[PDB]
Design a protein around this nucleic acid. Structure first.
Ligand SMILES: [Mg+2]
Ligand SMILES: [Mg+2]
Ligand SMILES: [Mg+2]
Ligand SMILES: [Mg+2]
Ligand SMILES: [Mg+2]
Ligand SMILES: [Mg+2]
Ligand SMILES: [Mg+2]
Ligand SMILES: [Mg+2]
Ligand SMILES: [Mg+2]
Ligand SMILES: [Mg+2]
Ligand SMILES: [Mg+2]
Ligand SMILES: [Mg+2]
Ligand SMILES: [Mg+2]
Ligand SMILES: [Mg+2]
Ligand SMILES: [Mg+2]
Ligand SMILES: [Mg+2]
Ligand SMILES: [Mg+2]
Ligand SMILES: [Mg+2]
Ligand SMILES: [Mg+2]
Ligand SMILES: [Mg+2]
Ligand SMILES: [Mg+2]
Ligand SMILES: [Mg+2]
Ligand SMILES: [Mg+2]
Ligand SMILES: [Mg+2]
Lengths: 100, 83, 210, 127, 115, 100, 117
RNA sequence: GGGCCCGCACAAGCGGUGGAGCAUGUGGUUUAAUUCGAUGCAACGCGAAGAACCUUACCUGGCCUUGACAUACUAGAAACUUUCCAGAGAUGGAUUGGUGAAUCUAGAUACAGGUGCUGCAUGGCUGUCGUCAGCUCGUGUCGUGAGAUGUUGGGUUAAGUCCCGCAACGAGCGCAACCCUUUUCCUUACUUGCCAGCAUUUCGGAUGGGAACUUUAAGGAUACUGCCAGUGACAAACUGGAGGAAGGCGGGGACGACGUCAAGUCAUCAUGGCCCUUACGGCCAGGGCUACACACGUGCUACAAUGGUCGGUACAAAGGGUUGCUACACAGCGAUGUGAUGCUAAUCUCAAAAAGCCGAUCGUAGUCCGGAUUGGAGUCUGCAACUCGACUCCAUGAAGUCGGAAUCGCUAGUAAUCGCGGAUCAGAAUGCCGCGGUGAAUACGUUCCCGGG
RNA sequence: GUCGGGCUCAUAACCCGAAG
RNA sequence: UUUU
């Protein structure tokens, strides 16, 4: 079969190293990686009034970004699904492993 | 206006009171805070005292007041002039 | 006036966040409000100790909290009754098996939280504010900091009109974003009201970014 | 004999493929007059090939996306000169003097917090 | 050229000139001209005196100047006499559809008054 | 906010959660077509005969910590005053000050 | 401002390669509707081309110094509108042929200055 | 009280406000109440990123009393879950199952509760001068000494920026730089995005395929007066030109020194003091915050021909979607309704961009301009649109023909003009915060007006 | 003269408009 | 030109 791995995170320094630590770990136990494709980033923004009572033009502008990376493993062996599922990954990364 | 596929809206306690009064041909006014119920063709004849914020104003239902809301016949704000 | 907060202005520059987890936009609020409770409970459950930072992570539907205290012996007690009962308390709030890690602070005179807490606990025993300020400034510059500022505000000395008094030793470059700077605020509950302590500690620049 | 150029103007791209042939053009599977109803966008598109006096020695296959009429016309012009100086670098001085080599980097300036539109502030009043 | 007791302009397209009758808009004029079978760009000047009769027949089927004016002026009287909120707002000549009166009601109230 | 307002909100959403299933199935019976018209009229009667506080239209979003009814953000569950404080000190994951 | 500044240069119009023509149609444009402006001026020029055959870029700059530059080009764009002739491309191409033969609307408008000169 | 310098401060230009109608905040007045706060610049589309009930603080009536909520005490009962009657509801009564921790009930003392007062008792947070260029220290020197010098003087700069003279020599915080985004290129990455070259085509990148190009998004390179000429004090800096995508700070943001105004906020929160405690606390239904002789601030729409209407036909960016967004089909003039498909999204969808281009018509009229106000008939959200919602259809068709004295914004992808999206939110934007399309005119200068050094 | 608007941190002079 |  095939494996698609989707990674979502608020930190891209973290998502990069999670992706490039999954890719080489797969490359060791076989071959056929299809690269960490970068999907476009979601950016949502907020305006927050910084004064307790009345000052409209005095606001702090905040931002949060969601990063998404895509990895495909096309023809995996019988020792790669375990070498993947036997892997601990640091906090702040959501990993979705799907077959179709 | 309310959608015609839902029908007219009348409160349930007010409808019970009206139907109870119509069967005994009573003349006592019906006191109510409803003010948002529609005037049904059955109400015609009765005397209803509707709240207006501070008092209950008496209203005599006429054959032309059918289809309005009760609170249309009890104004809430007081005004005479400015000079 | 109206300076920016020294920590939040450099949160993707030279400072990490104190919370490290991901959540779908419909689960974000529950998580946020569940760990704000953990902080607001731990800050008083460990008041006699010298806690300075609390880090919250959620690895794989779990909960990990690192408490960086200056005296772990009290937050642990005998080996097997404080870290083992705290965890049974942090699950009733997080709703998930919690874990508690300890990060002992060496040199607890270079984190602004502990300096501010000490100055406040002195001010709440009727010590002259200038004595306490000068003592702290002198005692942090020996530990190796490249600069420290202290600020105290509000009805000083039991007076009737409030004023602010600050003291500095060294460099404290606040407009340099690659300069790492610790910052803290604390409240002193005196017989006459509230007194506010602010501490800036400068420990050098950061070269390399993130 | 197929050279390639790319030209940005504001948010347009203009992939341009230049080759030898008679003088024929297509923009997005559409002749030049079918594409630009603005009659002065056509004479922005046709500027570099008529500067060198050639106008008839090259086939042009163009695609473009993003931006508006003027944006896409200037993008196509930029791409055409970049596909031209790829064939013969000798032409780069001349095409520089007419100002076709420079990328116009002017963009729309963001709106600002507390202003009407990026430089326009609300109406002031005393007393 | 004279329909519904009104003199309508003669050097004008028919769909434009038929709207000079009180009670006929543009949609109603389109409906009338289509039902009778006349194009909208025809001037009233270019109409035979035998088409104007079918136009008058079709116009008679909808309410026009006097009938409609009286129809409008009777509903307002009924409202004012029944004594609901709208009748009261009509007696006092103030907005009946919920607008603000602290400012901006000068179309119901008219020219301003000094003090 | 006062301490009676927060208990009023708790009261209201408790009652909303109690009457969720019944109100939903009455709403479904009403919007049906293959049922009797007397069916879909008695359903209307029983629907508007519930307590007023069983309707989610009477719920007002308040700050999770203090209880402020204004300046609410759905993504966070806090109002602007506490949002500024908890963001600027680093306790909200992913959020930074925004510059275009 | 308070120190010094320079002026801005204009790309000459793409059809007749003139700079004065570009500067003239920049005074006629409003709200950034340059299609309308170039339609108007190009129509005026291709009108005066078919009547009294003469090169347009030459006739235009010949009639400009009859009225003189910015303030000259303002009187033309003004007095051509307050005319009630037809579409603007035709009551602009009307004041040009008027002012060439010494008319009174924009040509003899500046004469009022020569009296008070 | 004098002198110099700077900034859309004036001057030059372009477009507005003051005039009309409507939206919105304020004052006043009215009211049972029209809840409270913000008053030159720096209050007046401000707290409020959204008052039908709720919100809600206000008014009228009906109700409770250790309480809606906490802690410590005693006695009884698993919490929990059905059916009904009265009542506007709060609230009382009756019924059905269920069998030491949690969990309700009853009683009782300390107490709880207070958006009640003081921002002139305060913490925290903010405005303002103002992104203005200043505020200091250690030595070494002068004045018995408090102190001075440094930091003042000639130029230059966005700048206490730099050079030069100088009893000063250095150093710190401010300025700049480090951070974000845009403009050129390079490397890794090749799907859900791409289609140059092959074939296949039901003409649809659609499908074999391809990894070029666009793009997506992570890391690098590049600009420094480096090169040429002059000006300039052996100077700093300035003027020109060659390359280069770009040239002298390339464009924009974030970042707001020491301090001023007893500036704003006890109604976000915390807090010293004072005050209420069968009420200044708590729970309900209805009303009010939407009133209307009037005055002001901020906006929107127009007064038309560079335009209105009708038919045809092009070109975006950025955002949102599972209690949600909906291809498509049918019904209706339409708002919408029913069915039914895809989508947890570079995949499906909002979604049509609009101004533009080509054609016809209107021919300067209070009009085929303008859309206020009113009558009639509907749709949707919601327990409910009377007071007091938004939208659709038919009819009606005000004022208004460019606005007195005066006054405002703007120095370039800016002003002007044209559409698109979101936060709040069941519903309710002409406000607020963003996104792209088209795309100008002007700057001789510093006497004058305003603020600052 | 009065009432409204303008200039002023405020006020008057002054300016604009209106009613009589 | 009156007052701070
Ligand atoms: Mg724009
Ligand atoms: Mg942009
Ligand atoms: Mg004014
Ligand atoms: Mg008519
Ligand atoms: Mg409180
Ligand atoms: Mg609500
Ligand atoms: Mg400027
Ligand atoms: Mg001026
Ligand atoms: Mg108060
Ligand atoms: Mg504003
Ligand atoms: Mg008791
Ligand atoms: Mg104060
Ligand atoms: Mg304060
Ligand atoms: Mg310096
Ligand atoms: Mg800086
Ligand atoms: Mg004060
Ligand atoms: Mg006050
Ligand atoms: Mg207090
Ligand atoms: Mg109420
Ligand atoms: Mg209000
Ligand atoms: Mg019209
Ligand atoms: Mg008139
Ligand atoms: Mg001055
Ligand atoms: Mg200076």
């Amino acid at each position: 079969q095939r494996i698609r791995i989707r990674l979502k995170s608020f930190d891209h320094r973290l998502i990069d190293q999670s992706a490039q630590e999954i890719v080489e770990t797969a490359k060791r136990t076989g071959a056929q990686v299809c690269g960490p494709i970068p999907m476009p980033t979601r950016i949502e923004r907020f305006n927050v009034l910084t004064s307790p009572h009345v000052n409209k033009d005095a606001r702090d502008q905040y931002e949060i970004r969601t990063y998404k990376r895509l990895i495909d493993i096309v023809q995996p062996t019988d020792k790669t699904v375990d070498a993947l599922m036997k892997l601990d990954l640091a906090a702040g990364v959501d990993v979705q492993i799907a077959l179709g | 206006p309310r959608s015609l596929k839902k029908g007219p809206f009348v409160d349930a306690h007010l409808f019970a009171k009206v139907e109870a009064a119509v069967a005994s041909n009573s003349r006592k006014p019906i006191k109510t805070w409803s003010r948002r119920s529609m005037i049904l063709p059955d109400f015609v004849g009765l005397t209803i005292s509707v709240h207006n914020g501070r008092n209950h104003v008496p209203v005599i239902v006429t054959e032309h007041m059918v289809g309005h809301k009760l609170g249309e016949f009890a104004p809430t704000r007081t005004y005479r002039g400015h000079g | 006036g109206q300076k920016v907060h020294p920590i939040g202005i450099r949160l993707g520059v030279v400072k990490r966040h104190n919370a490290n987890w991901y959540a779908n936009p419909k689960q974000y609020a529950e998580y946020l409000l569940k760990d704000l409770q953990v902080r607001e409970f731990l800050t008083k459950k460990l008041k006699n100790a010298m806690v300075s930072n609390i880090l919250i992570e959620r690895p794989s539907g779990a909960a990990k909290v690192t408490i960086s205290t200056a005296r772990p012996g009290i937050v642990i007690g005998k080996k097997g009754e404080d870290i083992e009962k705290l965890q049974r308390e942090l699950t009733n709030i997080m709703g998930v098996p919690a874990q508690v890690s300890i990060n002992e602070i060496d040199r607890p005179d270079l984190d602004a939280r502990l300096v501010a807490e000490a100055i406040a606990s002195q001010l709440e025993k009727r010590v002259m504010f200038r004595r306490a300020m000068k003592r702290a400034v002198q005692n942090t510059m020996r530990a190796g900091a490249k600069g420290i500022k202290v600020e105290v505000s509000g009805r000083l000395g039991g007076a009737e009109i409030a004023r602010t008094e600050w003291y500095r030793e060294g460099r404290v470059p606040l407009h340099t974003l690659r300069a790492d700077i610790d910052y803290a605020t604390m409240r002193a509950e005196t017989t006459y009201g509230t007194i506010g302590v602010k501490v800036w500690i400068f420990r050098g620049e950061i070269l390399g970014g993130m | 004999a197929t050279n390639y150029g790319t030209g940005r103007r504001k948010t347009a791209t203009a992939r341009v493929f230049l080759s030898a042939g008679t003088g024929k053009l297509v923009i997005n599977n559409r002749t030049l007059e079918q594409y630009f109803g603005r009659e002065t966008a056509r004479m922005v598109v046709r500027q570099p090939l008529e500067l060198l006096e050639a106008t008839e020695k090259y086939d042009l296959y163009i695609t473009v996306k993003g931006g508006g009429i003027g944006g896409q016309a200037g993008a196509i012009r930029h791409g055409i000169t970049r596909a031209l100086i790829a064939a013969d670098e000798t032409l780069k001085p001349v095409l520089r003097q007419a100002g076709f080599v420079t990328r116009d980097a002017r963009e729309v300036e963001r709106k600002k917090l507390g202003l009407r539109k990026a430089r326009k502030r609300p109406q002031f009043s005393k007393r | 050229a004279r329909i519904a007791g009104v003199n309508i302009p003669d050097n004008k397209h028919a769909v434009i000139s038929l709207t000079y009758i009180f009670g006929i808009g543009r949609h109603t004029a389109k409906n009338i001209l289509a039902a009778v079978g006349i194009t909208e760009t025809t001037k009233i000047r270019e109409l035979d005196d035998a088409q104007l009769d079918a136009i008058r027949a079709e116009v008679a089927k909808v309410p026009t100047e006097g009938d409609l004016r009286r129809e409008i002026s009777m509903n307002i009287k009924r409202l004012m006499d029944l004594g609901c909120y709208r009748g009261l707002r009509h007696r006092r000549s103030l907005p009946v559809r919920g607008q603000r009166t602290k400012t901006n009601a000068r179309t119901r109230k008219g020219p301003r008054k000094p003090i | 906010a006062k301490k009676g307002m927060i208990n009023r909100e708790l009261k209201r959403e408790k009652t909303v959660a109690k009457y969720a299933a019944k109100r939903a199935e009455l709403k479904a019976t009403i919007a049906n077509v293959n049922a009797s018209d007397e069916e879909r009229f008695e359903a209307m009667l029983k629907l508007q005969a519930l307590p007023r506080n069983a309707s989610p239209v009477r719920l007002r979003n308040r700050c999770g910590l203090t209880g402020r009814p204004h300046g609410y953000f759905r993504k966070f569950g806090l109002s602007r005053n506490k949002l500024r404080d908890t963001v600027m000190q680093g306790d909200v994951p992913g959020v930074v000050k925004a510059s275009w | 401002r308070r120190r010094v500044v320079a002026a801005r240069e204009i790309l000459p119009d793409p059809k007749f390669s003139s700079q004065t023509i570009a500067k003239f149609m920049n005074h006629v444009m409003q709200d950034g509707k340059k299609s309308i402006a170039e339609s108007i001026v190009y129509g005026a020029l291709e009108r005066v081309q078919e009547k009294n055959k003469v090169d347009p870029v030459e006739f235009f700059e010949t009639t400009l110094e009859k009225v003189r530059t910015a303030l000259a080009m303002r009187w033309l764009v003004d007095a051509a509108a307050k005319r009630s002739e037809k579409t603007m491309a035709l009551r602009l191409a009307g004041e040009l042929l008027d002012a060439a033969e010494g008319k009174g609307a924009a040509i003899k408008k500046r004469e009022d200055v020569h009296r008070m000169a």
